[PDB]
Ligand binder design. Structure first.
Ligand SMILES: [Cl-]
Ligand SMILES: [Cl-]
Lengths: 323, 322
């Protein structure tokens, strides 16, 4: 069995990547460049328990970032609702371009190794009006020399060596979700008893022009990974919680870069860009049940012809029949 | 770029090997088990120039067994003839099953990692009619514990463990293999174990056989396939059936013939191969000689079952991003 996902079909990996820059449309009226179609794809991961412990192991060591998985689970941040389907973290290259690799993988099962997503970000930042972005960024910077700092954030987005690439931060995620026209939700390491995490909405587009399922990422130790839904059926539902447990209460995930009126109508705004559902969960006061908001997650839609996970699964079967 | 060839498309490789066992026809009437269709496939290597030497070096390090290439070239056994196309040696695992690995690669661009060819060979020697084979082997051995000696040759072909993962194979194993494939095998080495030479599927009439050879290279107990380079005309697409030897041309050995077969060697060659008579430079520069050569097949492995075309698409993609 291959030691990583991409090794299962290098040829197909390259075909996928070569579709991506041709799916990009660049407007001429100042409108941000964005994907025409591919932003709607979503990967689901197959179930591995149908095998034997030694086999599980090799599958997990190849595909799964078990360190991040375990850290986020042990904080009750990942996979804490009994109602909902398990999410698993996929390994991702830690080269500085990992926000792009994790995002690329969630949708397309390949990493950003041609820098297509990375270049799209630097492009928007370097070669259009970013006034609104800067404004929303200044607001967030003050909730917790403007020109010097803004120039640096743009420079961070380049494909220049400073780790092969400059790491990226919140505003970069925000710009990226607007290039994809698709929300990104980051589940990050962080106990209140003792900033990257949160919800990024494509607010430069009307919600009707956007894909209404999120890309879900994990973040820990300065490293992004996709958190993709495990295939099952069923009866649990595909959703990601929009709040965290905080001891006896709940703390809403941070919604990034909102302007003041937007923040006033935050719940409404969330309900436009995401498919917001209510989920009963056991209370940690005397309560026993509370309803919390969660977003619906997409069902697997990445056609086999562009799905490395399908090919990976099929290698697994072949190698398992031989036991 | 991929470290080896199979890494180019691991999934396609699995599918290729999956097709192999179901292409084997298994007669009850005692006639040897053979391939219905897949023996007619041939791989070629793609042209590795038009690239710059750091990338040409990347490719050759990845795909070419340069040590064995250099060896067979310096001893003047491989690519000695300036009139025919260059052949290249592809890396092959040396686990003891490399006769099969090399042969499997030549036709299918994959190695015999599922032991389909290995098992077919053993299945022939252990579950069918081996009278005539044992006879030809005796005849050949005496040209220089016969039941026991033959008995271990049958065991060597097994998938048992011997210090490699598998027992090594010999001349008689090659001859049986060519009759399962219904296709000649030609081995180039430094004899020309005297493994070098021509192996014809004499348990079949030539009419029921594919008349293009599988070409292997052999040195240091190691087999590799010797495949043609793709776009290299005007040179002749053929392998010579003789070597230069001390000022003369000497026929490659033809293995396991009976006496009456040997009295008509040239006729047998012309039935099982596509023999052509070609001119080459003599030792006196005032002189040309006619020699026999056997036509080599054209690349016919469809893309859907060709690891080499995927490797090349990878290479192409990488070159533009450089
Ligand atoms: Cl010559
Ligand atoms: Cl000579």
């Amino acid at each position: 069995l291959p030691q990583a996902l991409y090794l299962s079909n290098m040829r197909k990996a390259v075909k996928i990547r070569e579709r991506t820059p041709e799916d990009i449309f660049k407007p001429t009226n100042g409108i941000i460049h964005h994907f025409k179609t591919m932003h709607r794809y979503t990967l689901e991961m197959f179930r591995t328990c149908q095998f034997c412990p030694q086999f599980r192991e090799i599958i997990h060591k190849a595909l799964i970032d078990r360190n991040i998985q375990a850290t986020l689970e042990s904080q009750k941040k990942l996979n804490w609702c009994r109602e909902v389907r398990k999410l698993v973290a996929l390994k991702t290259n830690g080269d500085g371009n990992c926000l792009m690799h994790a995002t690329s993988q969630y949708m397309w099962s390949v990493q950003d190794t041609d820098l297509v997503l990375r270049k799209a970000l630097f492009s928007t930042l370097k070669e259009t009006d970013t006034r609104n972005f800067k404004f929303r960024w200044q607001l967030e910077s003050l909730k917790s020399n403007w020109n010097d700092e803004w120039d640096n954030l743009i420079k961070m987005a380049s494909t220049d060596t400073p780790l092969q690439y400059n790491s990226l931060e919140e505003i970069h995620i925000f710009v990226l979700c607007n290039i994809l026209r698709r929300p990104i939700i980051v589940i990050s390491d962080k106990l209140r008893s003792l900033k990257v995490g949160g919800i990024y909405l494509p607010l430069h587009w009307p919600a009707q022009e956007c894909y209404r399922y999120p890309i879900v990422l994990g973040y820990d130790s300065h490293h992004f990974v996709p958190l993709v839904t495990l295939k099952d059926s069923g009866p649990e539902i595909r959703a990601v919680p929009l709040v965290n447990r905080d001891r006896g209460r709940f703390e809403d995930l941070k919604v990034h870069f909102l302007t003041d009126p937007e923040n006033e109508m935050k719940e409404k705004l969330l309900k436009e860009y995401l498919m917001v559902i209510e989920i009963p969960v056991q209370g940690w006061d005397h309560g026993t049940t509370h309803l919390i908001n969660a977003a619906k997650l997409d069902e697997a839609n990445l056609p086999k012809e562009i799905n490395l996970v399908d090919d990976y699964f099929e290698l697994v079967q072949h190698e398992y029949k031989k036991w």
